[PDB]
Amino acid sequence: MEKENLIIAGKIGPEPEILANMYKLLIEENTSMTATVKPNFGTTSFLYEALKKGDIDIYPEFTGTVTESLLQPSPKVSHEPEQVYQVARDGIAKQDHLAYLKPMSYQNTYAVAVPKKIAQEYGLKTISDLKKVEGQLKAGFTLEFNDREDGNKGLQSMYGLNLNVATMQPALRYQAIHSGDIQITDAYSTDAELERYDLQVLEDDKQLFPPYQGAPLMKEALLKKHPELERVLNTLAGKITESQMSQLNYQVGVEGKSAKQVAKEFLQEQVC
Ligand SMILES: C[N+](C)(C)[C@@H](Cc1c[nH]c(=S)[nH]1)C(=O)O
């Protein structure tokens, strides 16, 4: 009786924890394997390096993050989600022999956000509009967003924006923008905090941000050993809407429910 245990990790926050718990539930129900979820395991580069080193077995990675952060050189991608997925999938298999399974439906993009009041007061609708006020407002951005070419380096290069940026921890940036310590932050578009704190996402008028859909990323060797993982995890391929994920994020991060329970009830009610 081979009862291999898979280590399923997530980036920071309730959403990767929810996803990792969905993977665990699906794997334990439909395979002979068990899984352990590692919440808040780290940021993108750490999940990626841990995956390549074998320290974790699966994590949810996002299509535009594969092409921008993980592929070297980074290919030039369009705004069509399925083509970006194919670029990410083919590229990461060739580069790192990682198998990137089929993406979920929802997009979770970086989103430059300001309080509604600020957008109204300063006449902000687009990211380009921030040039109007870059000497007046303060931004608080995660370090990873600051480090990424599709993040603050891209605000600089694509938009010529020179924001006054405080580097922030992921879990502290929304309280900072809600309290007025900052007026700009790098939201994730499925974060529950956008609605909870009456924040407005500025339109990405120059299309800095690629599409970002999540999907399981694992070593090709793991899929070869356990080919059933493809069918089992692709249960979620093309499922989960933006509104659905944002509500799950609300349940875990705002209402404090366990990610396992929230994941289980969603799968029971909406997928299986
Ligand atoms: C979903 N997302 C917005 C495209 C980001 C979110 C993220 C980046 N780093 C951490 S931690 N989370 C990503 O996963 O690359």
Author numbering: 232 to 503
Sentences from the paper on this structure:
Here we show that spd_1642-1643 in Streptococcus pneumoniae, a Gram-positive respiratory pathogen, encodes an ET uptake ATP-binding cassette (ABC) transporter, designated EgtU. The TMD (EgtUB) and SBD (EgtUC) are fused into a single chain, denoted EgtUBC encoded by spd_1642. EgtUBC is predicted to contain six transmembrane helices in residues 1-230 (EgtUB), followed by the soluble, extracellular substrate-binding domain (EgtUC). The solute binding domain (SBD) of EgtU, EgtUC, binds ET with high affinity and exquisite specificity in a cleft between the two subdomains, with cation-π interactions engaging the betaine moiety and a network of water molecules that surround the thioimidazole ring.
Two structures of EgtUC-ET complexes were independently obtained, at 1.82 and 2.44 Å resolution. The 2.44 Å structure of the holo EgtUC contains the wild-type EgtUC residues 233-506, while the 1.82 Å structure, termed EgtUCCTT, has the C-terminal five residues, GLLKK, replaced by the pair of amino acids VC. Isothermal titration calorimetry shows that EgtUCCTT has ET binding affinity and thermodynamics that are identical to the wild-type protein. The structures are virtually identical with a pairwise heavy-atom RMSD of 0.206 Å over the common regions (residues 233–501), and we therefore use the higher resolution EgtUCCTT-ET structure to describe its features. The additional electron density found in the cleft between two domains corresponds precisely to that of L-ET, with the quaternary amine oriented toward the hinge and the bulky sulfur atom close to opening of the binding pocket. Given the short C-S bond in bound ET (1.596 Å), we conclude that it is the thione tautomer that is bound by EgtUC. As in some other subcluster F-III quaternary ammonium compound (QAC) binding proteins, notably Archaeoglobus fulgidus ProX (specific for GB), B. subtilis OpuBC (choline)42 and B. subtilis OpuCC (broad QAC substrate specificity), the aromatic residues Y341, Y419, Y443 and F293 form four sides of a pentagon and contribute cation-π interactions, while the base of the pentagon is formed by N339. The carboxyl group of ET makes electrostatic interactions with K242, T296 and R379. The thioimidazole moiety of ET protrudes from the pentagonal cage toward the opening of the ET binding cleft, with the imidazole ring aligned roughly parallel to the domain interface. A string of highly ordered, high occupancy water molecules appears to surround the thioimidazole ring, making close contacts with the thione S and imidazole Nε2, while also bridging conserved tyrosines Y419 and Y341 from each of the two domains.
